[PDB]
Amino acid sequence: AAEELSRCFSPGVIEVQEVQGKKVARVANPRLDTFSREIFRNEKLKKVV
């Protein structure tokens, strides 16, 4: 779900690191974001961000 999150934003904003075997999404650079509000179409991650 970290990758689906990283695709609902301008691509540089959510940098998906690999802290453990699992993948964590982190907000690397908020400034690159264009307001497209494409998370709000996800219906499961509009509650997370």
Binding site: S10, R31, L32, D33, T34
Partner: protein, 51 residues
């Protein structure tokens, strides 16, 4: 020695020339249906924010 009326004909034949029907195949169109408009592959964003 003249011409006289003879016996009435017993039947009539009417001839016409006719060809026949082929199988129904119903080949509607070369490239058929209304083919849908669609996505160019990959595309990519052609615009970025400032900063």
């Amino acid at each position: 020695g003249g011409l006289t009326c003879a016996s009435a004909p017993q039947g009539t034949l009417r001839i016409l020339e006719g060809p026949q029907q082929s199988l129904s195949g119903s080949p509607l169109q070369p490239i058929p249906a209304s083919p849908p408009p669609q996505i160019p592959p990959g595309l990519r964003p052609r615009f970025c924010a400032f900063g």
